[PDB]
Amino acid sequence: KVFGRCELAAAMKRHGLDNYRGYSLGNWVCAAKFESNFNTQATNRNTDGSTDYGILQINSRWWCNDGRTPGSRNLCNIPCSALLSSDITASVNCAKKIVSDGNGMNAWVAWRNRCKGTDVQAWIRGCRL
Ligand SMILES: [Cl-]
Numbered sequence: 001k002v003f004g005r006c007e008l009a010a011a012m013k014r015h016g017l018d019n020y021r022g023y024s025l026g027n028w029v030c031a032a033k034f035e036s037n038f039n040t041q042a043t044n045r046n047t048d049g050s051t052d053y054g055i056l057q058i059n060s061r062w063w064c065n066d067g068r069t070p071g072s073r074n075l076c077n078i079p080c081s082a083l084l085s086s087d088i089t090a091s092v093n094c095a096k097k098i099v100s101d102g103n104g105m106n107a108w109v110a111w112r113n114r115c116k117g118t119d120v121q122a123w124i125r126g127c128r129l
Pocket residue numbers: 021103104105
């Protein structure tokens with residue numbers, strides 16, 4: 001599914017991401033544009049050989065098991081495939097655990113490289129609040 005911008009803003013608020021560990025809702029919406037272009041089915045290869053999955057692009061080396069990444073820890077006890085669904089619960093439960101891993105949202109290179117230091121409110125401007 002390719003979520004509409006305000007549709008995704010609405011969903012992440014439902015699960016309690018607005019201001020989670022101090023990161024305003026718009027930082028998450030901003031992360032989800034640039035990681036995946038708003039698409040729950042997104043999958044990408046990293047060099048280290050790991051793959052990034054879904055809306056936020058959760059990585060298989062630590063975070064979910066995909067069976068092809070040596071040394072995977074499956075720190076969300078989850079199949080990476082389940083994070084491509086249309087129901088973003090698993091991707092949020094896991095994202096809550098990553099962000100809480102100390103380096104915050106800097107765990108997302110597109111957040112660092114593109115969201116951070118910006119007016120992350122443009123990402124929810126027009127959302128019915
Ligand atoms: Cl932080």
